[PDB]
Paper text:
LPyV VP1 forms a ring-shaped homopentamer in which the five monomers are arranged around a central five-fold axis and connected by extensive interaction surfaces.
The LPyV VP1 structure contains one bound Ca2+ ion per chain that is coordinated by the carboxylate group of E46 and the carbonyl group of S214cw as well as several water molecules. These residues are highly conserved among all polyomaviruses and form one of the two calcium binding sites in the SV40 virion that are important for capsid stability and regulating assembly. While the Ca2+ ions in our structures likely come from the crystallization solution containing 0.2 M calcium chloride, they nevertheless demonstrate that unassembled VP1 pentamers can weakly bind Ca2+ ions. In order to determine whether conformational changes occur in the protein during ligand binding, we compared the complex structures with the unliganded LPyV VP1 structure. In all chains in which the tip of the BC2cw-loop and adjacent residues are not engaged in crystal contacts, the structures are very similar, indicating that the binding site does not undergo a permanent induced fit movement. In two chains, however, a crystal contact perturbed the native structure of the BC2cw-loop, but not the ligand-bound one. This hypothesis is supported by the B-factors of receptor-binding residues, which are elevated in the unbound structure compared with the complexes.
Author numbering:
A (entry chain A), E (entry chain E): 25 to 301
B (entry chain B), C (entry chain C): 25 to 300
D (entry chain D): 25 to 299
Amino acid sequence: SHMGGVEVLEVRTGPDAITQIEAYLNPRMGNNIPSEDLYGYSNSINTAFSKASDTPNKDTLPCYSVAVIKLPLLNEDMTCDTILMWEAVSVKTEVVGISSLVNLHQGGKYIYGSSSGCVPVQGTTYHMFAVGGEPLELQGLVASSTATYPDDVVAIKNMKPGNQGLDPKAKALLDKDGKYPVEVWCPDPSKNENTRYYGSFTGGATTPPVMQFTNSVTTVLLDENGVGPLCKGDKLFLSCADIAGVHTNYSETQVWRGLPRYFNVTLRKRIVKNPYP
Amino acid sequence: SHMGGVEVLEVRTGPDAITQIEAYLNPRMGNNIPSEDLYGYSNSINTAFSKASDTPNKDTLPCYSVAVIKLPLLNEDMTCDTILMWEAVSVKTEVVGISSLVNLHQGGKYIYGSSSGCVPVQGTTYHMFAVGGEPLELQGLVASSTATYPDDVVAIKNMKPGNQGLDPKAKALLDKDGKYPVEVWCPDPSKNENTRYYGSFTGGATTPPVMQFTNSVTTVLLDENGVGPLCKGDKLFLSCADIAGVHTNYSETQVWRGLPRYFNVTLRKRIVKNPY
Amino acid sequence: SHMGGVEVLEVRTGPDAITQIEAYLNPRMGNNIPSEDLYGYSNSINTAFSKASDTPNKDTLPCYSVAVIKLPLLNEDMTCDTILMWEAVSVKTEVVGISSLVNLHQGGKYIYGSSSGCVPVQGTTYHMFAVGGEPLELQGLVASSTATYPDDVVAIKNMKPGNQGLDPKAKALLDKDGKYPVEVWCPDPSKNENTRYYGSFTGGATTPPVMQFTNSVTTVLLDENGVGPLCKGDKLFLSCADIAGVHTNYSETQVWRGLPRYFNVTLRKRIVKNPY
Amino acid sequence: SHMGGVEVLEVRTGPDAITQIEAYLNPRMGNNIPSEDLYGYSNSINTAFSKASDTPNKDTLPCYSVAVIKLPLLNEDMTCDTILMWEAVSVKTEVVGISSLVNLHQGGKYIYGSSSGCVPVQGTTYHMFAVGGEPLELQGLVASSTATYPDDVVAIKNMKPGNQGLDPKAKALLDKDGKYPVEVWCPDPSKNENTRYYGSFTGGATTPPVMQFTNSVTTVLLDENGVGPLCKGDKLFLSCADIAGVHTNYSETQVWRGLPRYFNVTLRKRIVKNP
Amino acid sequence: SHMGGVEVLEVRTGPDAITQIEAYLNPRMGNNIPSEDLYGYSNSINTAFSKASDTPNKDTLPCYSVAVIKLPLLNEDMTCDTILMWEAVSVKTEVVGISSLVNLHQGGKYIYGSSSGCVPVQGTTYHMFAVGGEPLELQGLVASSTATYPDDVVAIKNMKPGNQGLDPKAKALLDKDGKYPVEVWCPDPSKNENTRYYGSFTGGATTPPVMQFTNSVTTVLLDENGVGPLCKGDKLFLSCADIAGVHTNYSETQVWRGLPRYFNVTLRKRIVKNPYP
Ligand SMILES: [Ca+2]
Ligand SMILES: [Ca+2]
Ligand SMILES: [Ca+2]
Ligand SMILES: [Ca+2]
Ligand SMILES: [Ca+2]
């Protein structure tokens, strides 16, 4: 016999330089307050009278969700040659409540006749998430520049037909939860150096939604130079939109259905040359 | 000539540190007892009168399957510095009876007219499995908070419109076979550190189902720290739901159709620092 | 100025320890004899009167194909400590006649109206192959236990509603070509240690079929322990089912359409501890 | 400072042992001659009267394309113990004219009504290519053995119901351009040792076609023994069929639409023991 | 304790040998001028009277976009045995405005009835981009040689039924923005040695569009010999076409919808044996 190693499993505290945060963001489909009957859905989609006259009603436009996570304070002040910053290195994220769509008894349009189950959520889907050290930078682009957007959303200022394409003046920050419509704003690829975003769109009138879920998948956030998002002011920005599709009522009115998203982000303390004047 | 090695194939009894279990879980679509005529299917889906009035009939709601496999006993003493635990390291799993869907003679809605084959199982599908060292932890979220769930399923306590999104109070453990509805409960990603789960959903009214089967594929259960699920009290929890779609009757009533799932899990004995 | 190697291409005969076999399996959709007008298709699918009364006509049920290939004999003496066995290490396989589906002039239902081409083969597809050193082990599972299967197919003995799920009593060996219905039998994932199988299913009433073909792809048959199927009694079992979809007649009666599959298997001699 | 390497870009001519060939093959959908109005398409698909009476009209059947590329001559006398042969080692291939399908103004069946765009090419698609050192070897298999094929195509000799499955007597070589129907002939997997073929099929009546194009992709032609097709008689065989779908006319008659394929093949000289 | 390395994050200059450019190209669907109401869309697609009489209206034909980016001047003149050239080595590219398609209120054809949402953009899609050191080389091929193309597009000269297949005389350079119709011209695979192009097509009358967006993906532009496009005259050519599908009006007339594309290209200075006579 001899002395040798055996690997024992035990609870390990990570080093002090590493932290994990967890958060969930509830959808902002238009009914955005938990007490509302249609929480998690938009109001009925009202369609344009004409191109000239297209006025979506209040709460009919799905908007991005965003949360700002306050991270542990790293610096006494900002006066040294270097400072400490949290660097986001990886994320596990999941759309929660996918199985809620496996429901054919909810009141709606019938698949066949009134003896059958009801048509489930389907049609256009849009799933995106972002993790950044500052607000996600947005580019404005719309289907129609003559749409009149309601007061409670942030739309493009002085919208003109050029906004049906890319006008570099149409830019915003995703700095408010449930205020920036998905149909008006998309991530700005000419910026976002300090954010990672990922998105998937499938269109079509009645297309079946497709979603996966697992707790086994991690997305590494390091860029091509091996650096993750660096959290300015010790703030982590989590952004998403998860439009599952539309639910159709028996009367054939339709409402958008959104689902919440969970994030679990690992961050590490980094020494960084002081970027603050 | 010289002495050399030649590899002879033989039945190897694995080292005592390793074990394998096999199990199958029958679906729990609502007719959950093998003596029932519609075993493997739900009863006819009854749809809501109104949002205010939505009362699914008993046995119309597909539920998760769960089995608890008792593993060989490891510790006759639970008071030492360390104890032994089974660590689940990999799994092979397969949906069984996929070929049973390849059937156009079963009575139902006709594809074209009364001379044609009948519409096979189609529509929404949902396939998930979990392997864990304790019950799968669940998060409640429903399409409508005003549904009244029957007393033979576990649903969200004190359900309110907030349950149409994520309310962190709506939590449960998958600790009962065939009692937790799929449409109410999903895996809770904020917990489940000691479980691995995998799921795939495709919706739509009439979507063709798509399924693969092979005995060549293994999923490794080790997490990012190289550790698999650790089986508390020497119990392995296997969970799943395999909704293949709906079958439509000639009358156009529809029933969910589920399929069984087979698991083959490899585990190894680990020395673990005692939690007590 | 120097002696050096140059690679010359020549016909190389493999080492004695390696052999290759080629085979093809014709489809067994119901018309299973090449003299039959509808060879390679089933007869018209007849649908159930009711759940209680579901009697598929003879030759309306697609069945698995199987071929047993005799390999060179290895052991004249079966009494030593070890014996030799053929180990299947890789397979190249192809569904043949895919291009025969690229045909819109064949009589049937019209795509648009009587001036258009005819609806091609489409709907439910099922493609599987297995390579093993013994018959593929099957599990019985049906869509309906009240179906009465005809006497020219092997069905589940003493069928009960429990056979709509997984009943471990409902087991068989794929040991007859064109007799085991696809809709009754699937590979048994709890056995088949000595076989590798691979299957793909897409359902739906009218789904477009999708198929690839190439002679550039090989599948390795080695399991997790680096061991391929071992051919008991020097017999190699090839199994498959390749249902391309259904053809629809102008009358709207429907028939299954199957395609042949080709196999090319490489095997190597192994020394194996003598079981008997 | 020190002597060191710096990489300068310049035109490099490959070694004498390596050569590249380019070719394109136009589709043979039935209208196979460039001066014909429907060049690149079949004639209207005429459907069977009955299973017994199924006679496709002339030029309604898409056929494989094949080109023989004559490579530089390698051997003076074929009586040496070894000879030289060209070995095809890689290919870049592309379906050309994919963008021609992005056309909703072409006359035809309307998507919604007479104010809308016209239904584009869709339905059954079939894309294959082969690169080999001899003709592609074909297996016959048909949907129906009682079809009567036209005189201008090569069909299965003495067709029988057995030809609805695999009959090993039904074999042919793809040695004539626009003569071997796709619906009769497929690559024979039991042969073709000296060829590489690749195919993709999607069926269905009205299925959307899906196609990719890029100049960044190369397929290596070496087999599991590290050897590519060897060009017998210094001849390279290029084969394909690229059926994009069917076009539907206002009258609802339908025609197959094919697209051309480009090939770029790299070959190297090899010393080969004389057959 | 000992002297050891610690990795500090800072803004790094990047060598003088490397440069990055960014650009966006707006779609050229037919309404190509920002002031036009239907900017970003074609005019209504008018269909042929017959095969012999097929005359698409002005501005109904989507065309390729192209931009020429002027890079930093590298050489005093072209008189030396070797010159410096920019070599494009990688690109990040994104279709901008994908989220704008997540809009069911825009006027149009109804999904179910006048109470429901409107049918979103769907049907034929075509997405391609190219990065090159000279104009993309094009091959002409049409669905019908008897179509009459408008004066304001570059069509195949002396079109004949042979142009329904590949005729080697039907060749062009993509050297004008919004002039070369997608349905006439495709990348010429027999040339384009000095360009990298990538394309995806999905046809069908009503097919749901599918698009991804992320800022985490880079395409390497080096060929099989390890060489990227070399920029002749210090000009980088960016080409694309991004047809999202068609929008259908209530009247059932249809228009093509295109979306802008962003490019971020990384280039390096190379010594090149002088190719200019
Ligand atoms: Ca920038
Ligand atoms: Ca947690
Ligand atoms: Ca077993
Ligand atoms: Ca052979
Ligand atoms: Ca060339």
